[PDB]
Amino acid sequence: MYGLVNKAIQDMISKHHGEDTWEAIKQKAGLEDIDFFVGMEAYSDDVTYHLVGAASEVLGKPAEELLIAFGEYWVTYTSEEGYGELLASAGDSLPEFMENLDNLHARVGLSFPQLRPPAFECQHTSSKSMELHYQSTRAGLAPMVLGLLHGLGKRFQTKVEVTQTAFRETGEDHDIFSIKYE
Amino acid sequence: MYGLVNKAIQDMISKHHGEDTWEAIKQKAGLEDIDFFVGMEAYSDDVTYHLVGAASEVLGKPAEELLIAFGEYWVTYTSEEGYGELLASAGDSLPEFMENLDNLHARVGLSFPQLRPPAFECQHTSSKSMELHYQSTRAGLAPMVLGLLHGLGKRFQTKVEVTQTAFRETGEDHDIFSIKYE
């Protein structure tokens, strides 16, 4: 993924547990080479999965727990490290924001030309709920989606309950989530 | 399962979509025979699975969506139809409550002598998270667990993020969930 994603993971861990723990985690991941991540440069996905795996071992937490945290962090981190206006342009409510999400990533992708963004389709089951279809070229990041949805809830002061109802992981064509809000 | 469970399903559907729908649903499940469920009597599990499938066809919603709703409802329905004090005895926080859950179901089963309750084990990964191990003699109810957990979040005013990381369905030994709270 682009290095911004890894820089975020680093930031989150550095801020929550310290530079020593980040160093250990980098080292365990077999990335001591890399002095720093370049935000606008493409890295092999490997780098991200390894960091997450290594972060799991060192912190003694499951990978999935970290991806949930990281999902929520990213909402804050993007608003502060140069994507605040772009974020705000995507709307001022959760369902609006999610409807716009492919369009946000399209805009991101003019600037990051090699982006393989996820794809998100909403079916609104009412004014307070929806089905969210998450399609990705990558495996394993549904728990990140969950955290991202909870970060979006914080951003719009909406309470969101999210439950995953289909799993790419088992062989289903793609992750699907039921979501209830305010 | 005991009829209480089926009575709760009936109630949730009558209250949400009307008696006419309930009838259809009951009709579709091939249970027109049964005039009312007896709360303290044992039914074949068959009855609950048919009602759920039938509810899915009549309503145009996936089974899994209904089980999530039903899980959340049950938390409210038990507190109002005779299990309020027992619920409250199980604690005033989500992680406490989950640690007490086998004990709760044990008390329930002195009163319901043929109870096949689930089993839940918590490994706390921090003061705000845990791995929850759901063991059951039955298949299919993981989405019900998700709703129940959201229902418990409501009861304790805690925001809970839940993601399932192992699936009995696929032949893994049992369902496992990563959970983050408030």
Ligand code: HEM
């Ligand atoms: C300003 C806001 C955002 C920016 C700059 C951003 C940028 C990115 C970038 C650069 C990637 C890497 C894709 C790649 O390298 O191939 C990505 C992936 C991702 N984005 Fe965003 N994004 C933003 C907001 C969001 C939000 C709010 C969500 C919420 C659901 C979201 C969900 C994801 C997901 C799930 C991926 C995972 C990759 C995959 O599934 O294939 N993004 N995004």
Ligand code: HEM
């Ligand atoms: C407070 C009152 C509660 C009562 C009275 C109650 C009673 C029951 C009863 C009677 C069953 C049917 C089992 C059978 O017929 O053999 C059952 C199943 C179940 N209970 Fe509860 N329970 C309560 C709360 C909860 C809560 C909060 C949860 C949250 C996790 C929970 C999780 C379940 C699950 C998952 C089942 C499904 C059966 C299975 O996995 O085998 N229960 N409970």
Ligand SMILES: CC(=O)n1ccnc1
């Ligand atoms: C990979 C990452 O932190 N994200 C999450 C959403 N968009 C990019």
Ligand SMILES: CC(=O)n1ccnc1
């Ligand atoms: C069958 C069912 O939803 N439950 C859940 C908790 N206790 C009973």
